[PDB]
Ligand binder design. Structure first.
Ligand SMILES: Nc1ncnc2c1ncn2[C@@H]1O[C@H](COP(=O)(O)OP(=O)(O)OP(=O)(O)O)[C@@H](O)[C@H]1O
Ligand SMILES: Nc1ncnc2c1ncn2[C@@H]1O[C@H](COP(=O)(O)OP(=O)(O)OP(=O)(O)O)[C@@H](O)[C@H]1O
Ligand SMILES: [Ca+2]
Ligand SMILES: [Zn+2]
Ligand SMILES: [Zn+2]
Lengths: 296, 81, 222
């Protein structure tokens, strides 16, 4: 009975463990550095802070979280029976590997440093399926996004070479010195790429904004205008814009795939797969066909 | 006015299936209360109705028949004032 | 305005996803703020105008740092890097700072806020697709029996007359009222049957996938 009791309440331990994880993060976020069930826990934590203090309260909350998770892990292995699948299987199991890593993070957070509790918020992704689906919108086509970034990097590389060869003089950057303000930044090819990449992509206008304002009467004025315009139309409107297009395309693909899967599941029965429309004007209906006649 | 108006406008026909599966057509008079149904309610029912699991919307339509009858009854009493 | 309501429905339907994405954005901002406090605390300098020094530190405590990063980082197009002081290229910590802003730009402005936008577009497409299907079903099949328009082809009785008179739902509603109103002793054959069926709560007397108009060919076959 004892192990069964631990395994039966899996939602309770997981809900609490996440529940404590959230409260510890807010407390450290709000106070660091320092010298209904949910409202009830809020009152207890607030009361402990008032009397015990920020320090002891954080230490207690960490101790409860560690105890909750370790018993959560032992229950998880017992309920899932990963050992029966094979000792090699549990080691290679993704869910088991994630849990031990979280356990390691919890103990490090309790002892190594308080801020390690911050990364525990990543568990929220696992807790919420909708957020996981949103993340899947970028993970499914991650290769395309990475390649587009590589194509972007190549374009910035080409523009940096052109700027160094022709427009090296105009590459002037303002810097604040800790206890001249402006100085050149394209003296060497490497630093030129960093300046264009770091300050060009981020800026809405692009590379042109960071560079010095060109005189309208200057002879090289038309060259600068074309150069700046090309970067705007080749690196900010057709390169970064594509990356978001991939994300939108993935969103549509995921929705379409989910819709088709749900329709198949709710329209045809598991075993024989006959469509619902077949079970029309018959003594036996589709609902009873799947419930009893073709119950998997 | 027109003699063949009260006996014509208040007439309707429907289709039903009996126990023996033999379809029949029923021609019946339209009761006076039924004539008081509001057009706005008629449009709402047509658009708001949703399909059930079988894809047949008849179940939802029948379930709201009693509400329509009560609404028509209030309309008759409202028309009195 | 219904059109404006539909536009608002484009964000209301998937409001939970948008809120969760905002929570993920807050979590990422929280992590970046922690990293800045540990490593790049000195560089966190903000300019302020005093009502009747101009620049002072803003990351002295964690709470102020997160507000500065969240308030002035997400809003700025570049991200966190714009608000922070300009780093010297020859400074030793220049590469670390450069990576810091680029990560924020590629992790909080291009793949987080853009996701919130993408959710809105997905809702827009979903709403249009659902509306299009509903209108097609309403205008292509009749309410009572649900037969498709293509069935009423090359027949004496057309689809328009099939729904107008043969399968008029309001006629069925009128019959329901008549059956409910009329007395038991005055019931006829068909009226007695439906009254019994209505009491049994079995909705089978309604025709399904069949009508007399198409049975006319069946009658010829008979
Ligand atoms: N062939 C099938 N096609 C589609 N759905 C099916 C099929 N067989 C079962 N299901 C569905 O899968 C689930 C499994 O049915 P199950 O008999 O376990 O239901 P239950 O109501 O939980 O059981 P109980 O009979 O103890 O009340 C139910 O949703 C059932 O509708
Ligand atoms: N079974 C059905 N399938 C499709 N459309 C239907 C069905 N029953 C009714 N309708 C439509 O719903 C509306 C209700 O028809 P109704 O007879 O009330 O029209 P009306 O022209 O306003 O009436 P009146 O006969 O007094 O001129 C019409 O658009 C009719 O086409
Ligand atoms: Ca009699
Ligand atoms: Zn089957
Ligand atoms: Zn019909």
């Amino acid at each position: 009975p004892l192990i069964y009791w631990f395994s039966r309440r899996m939602t309770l331990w997981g809900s609490i463990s996440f529940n404590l994880a959230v409260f510890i993060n807010i407390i450290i976020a709000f106070f660091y550095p320092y010298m209904s069930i949910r409202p009830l826990i809020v009152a207890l934590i607030l009361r402990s802070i008032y009397y015990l203090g920020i320090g002891p309260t954080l230490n207690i909350l960490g101790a409860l979280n560690l105890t909750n998770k370790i018993v959560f892990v032992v229950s998880f292995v017992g309920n899932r029976g990963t050992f029966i699948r094979g000792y090699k299987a549990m080691v290679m199991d993704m869910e088991f590997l994630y849990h031990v890593g979280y356990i390691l993070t919890s103990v490090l957070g309790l002892f190594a440093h308080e801020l390690f509790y911050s990364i525990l918020l990543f568990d929220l992704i696992y807790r919420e399926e909708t957020l996981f689906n949103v993340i899947k919108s970028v993970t499914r086509n991650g290769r395309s996004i990475l390649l587009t970034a590589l194509l972007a990097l190549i374009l910035v590389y080409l523009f940096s070479i052109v700027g160094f060869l022709f427009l090296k003089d105009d590459f002037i950057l303002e810097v604040d010195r800790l206890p001249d303000s402006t100085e050149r930044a394209c003296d060497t090819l490497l630093m030129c790429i960093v300046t264009v990449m770091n300050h060009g992509l981020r800026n809405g206008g692009g590379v042109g904004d960071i560079l010095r304002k060109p005189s309208k009467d200057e002879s090289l004025f038309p060259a600068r205008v074309v150069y700046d315009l090309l970067f705007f139309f080749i690196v900010i409107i057709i390169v970064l814009n594509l990356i978001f297009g991939v994300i939108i395309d993935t969103f549509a693909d995921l929705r379409s795939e989910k819709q088709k899967k749900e329709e198949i599941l709710k329209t045809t029965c598991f075993i024989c797969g006959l469509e619902r429309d077949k079970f029309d004007n018959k003594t036996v209906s589709f609902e009873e066909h799947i419930k009893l006649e073709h119950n998997m | 006015e027109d003699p063949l108006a009260y006996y014509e406008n208040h007439t309707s026909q429907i289709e039903i299936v009996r126990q023996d599966r033999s379809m029949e057509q029923i021609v019946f008079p339209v009761p006076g209360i039924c004539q008081f149904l509001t057009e706005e309610t008629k449009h709402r029912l047509f658009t708001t109705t949703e399909q059930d699991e079988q894809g047949s919307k008849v179940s939802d339509f029948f379930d709201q028949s009693s509400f329509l009858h009560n609404e028509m009854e209030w309309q008759r009493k409202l028309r009195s004032m | 305005e219904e059109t404006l309501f539909n536009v608002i429905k484009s964000v209301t339907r998937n409001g939970r996803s948008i809120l969760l994405t905002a929570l993920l954005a807050l979590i990422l901002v929280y992590l970046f703020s922690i990293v800045g406090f540990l490593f790049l605390k000195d560089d966190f300098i903000l300019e302020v105008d005093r009502l009747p020094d101009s620049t002072e530190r803003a990351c002295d405590t964690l709470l102020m740092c997160i507000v500065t990063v969240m308030n002035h980082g997400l809003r700025n197009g570049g991200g966190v890097g714009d608000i922070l002081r300009k780093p010297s290229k020859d400074e030793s910590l220049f590469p670390a700072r450069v990576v810091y802003d680029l990560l924020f730009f590629f992790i909080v402005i291009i793949i987080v806020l853009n996701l919130i936008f993408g959710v809105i577009i997905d809702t827009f497409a979903d709403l249009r697709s659902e509306k299009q299907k509903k209108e097609e079903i309403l205008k292509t099949t009749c309410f009572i029996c649900g037969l498709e328009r293509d069935k009423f082809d090359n027949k004496t009785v057309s689809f328009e007359e099939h729904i107008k008179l043969e399968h008029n739902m309001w006629n069925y509603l009128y019959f329901i009222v008549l059956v409910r109103v009329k007395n038991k002793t005055d019931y006829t054959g068909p009226e007695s049957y439906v009254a019994q069926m209505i009491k049994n709560k079995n909705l089978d007397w309604f025709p399904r996938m069949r009508a007399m108009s198409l049975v006319s060919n069946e009658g010829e076959g008979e």
